[PDB]
Amino acid sequence: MNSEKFFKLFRVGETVLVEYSGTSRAELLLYYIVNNSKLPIVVDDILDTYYEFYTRLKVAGFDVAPLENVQVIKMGGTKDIGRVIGRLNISKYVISEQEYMEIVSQLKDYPVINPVLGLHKLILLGNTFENINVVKMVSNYVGREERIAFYFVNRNVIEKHSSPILDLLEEVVTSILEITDSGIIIKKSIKDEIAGKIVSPLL
């Protein structure tokens, strides 16, 4: 389907959890979301995960120019991809809400489509206490109508490291998508009209 038709499945302010595995080729959905987007794209890049998506798409033969043109907010890492507009540090595997808000202030083209890559990395690295703060990190932004956030997370990484943390994560978001071989399953949604349905937006 058309890019903007897909976004119509969500409301401004939502936090969407996109669960995928290593065989899912999640970078394809990320490309679909960024390519020819009608709204401004802002990527929160955790631990150089955007660079990984980028290189995989580049090798696949995609035109990565669109990925290079979006604005990015790095949280750790040393490989800059896209228009970096901010660089936050990660202490105790969590960012500074103070610094983060000071960075988005330079944005004024709201609303924006906000993909967040690499959250599962932070979770794998920390203990229960630090994992809980990472989730608080996510729930702290749910509802801010400045954007629609898409948290791409490798489901298995989180499940196997700490199953309780995955459950907390699915609880605080408003919608949950799961990339499977036959398409994208809408596990949870604000619109009961689409809950449990499977869509194939890339067709």
Beta strands in the chain (DSSP E): 15-20, 42-46, 71-75, 83-88, 112-117, 147-154, 175-180, 183-188, 198-199
Stretch that binds Cl ion, among 45-53, 124-132, 136-144, 195-203 (CB under 5 A): 195-203
Write down the least CB distance from residue 154 to a copy of itself, Å.
Answer: 6
Q: Is the peptide bond before 164 cis (omega within 30 degrees of 0)?
A: no
**Is the dihedral angle over the CA atoms 30, 92, 13, 20 positive or is it negative?**
positive
Question: Residue 86: which of 95, 111, 94, 121 has the closest Cα?
Answer: 95
Q: Which is nearer to a copy of itself, 11 or 87 (CB)?
A: 11
* Secondary structure class of 18 (helix, strand, coil): strand
Q: Which is nearer to a copy of itself, 44 or 53 (CB)?
A: 53
Residue numbers at the binding site for a copy of itself (CB under 8 A): 11, 13-14, 21-23, 25-26, 48, 52, 55-56, 58-61, 121, 124-125, 128-129, 132, 136, 139, 142-143, 154, 156-158, 160-161, 163-164, 166-174, 176, 181, 187-188, 190, 192, 195-196
Stretch that binds Cl ion, among 31-39, 79-87, 162-170, 191-199 (CB under 5 A): 191-199
200 binds Cl ion (CB under 5 A): yes
16/42 Cα distance (integer angstroms): 15
132/165 Cα distance (integer angstroms): 7
Of the candidate residues 1, 60, 142, 195, the single one contacting Cl ion (CB under 5 A):
1
CB-side exposure of 80: number of CA atoms within 13 Å?
Answer: 8
Q: Which is nearer to Cl ion, 58 or 191 (CB)?
A: 191
- By residue count, the chain amounts to 203
Token pair of 55 as six digits: 């290189």
24/17 Cα distance (integer angstroms): 15
Q: Which is nearer to a copy of itself, 85 or 130 (CB)?
A: 130
Binding partner of 52, given Cl ion, a copy of itself, none, CB within 5-8 angstroms per partner class: a copy of itself
Q: Which is nearer to a copy of itself, 56 or 87 (CB)?
A: 56
Binding partner of 83, given Cl ion, a copy of itself, none, CB within 5-8 angstroms per partner class: none
Question: Residue 116: which of 150, 80, 143 has the closest Cα?
Answer: 150
Write down the least CB distance from residue 73 to a copy of itself, Å.
Answer: 20
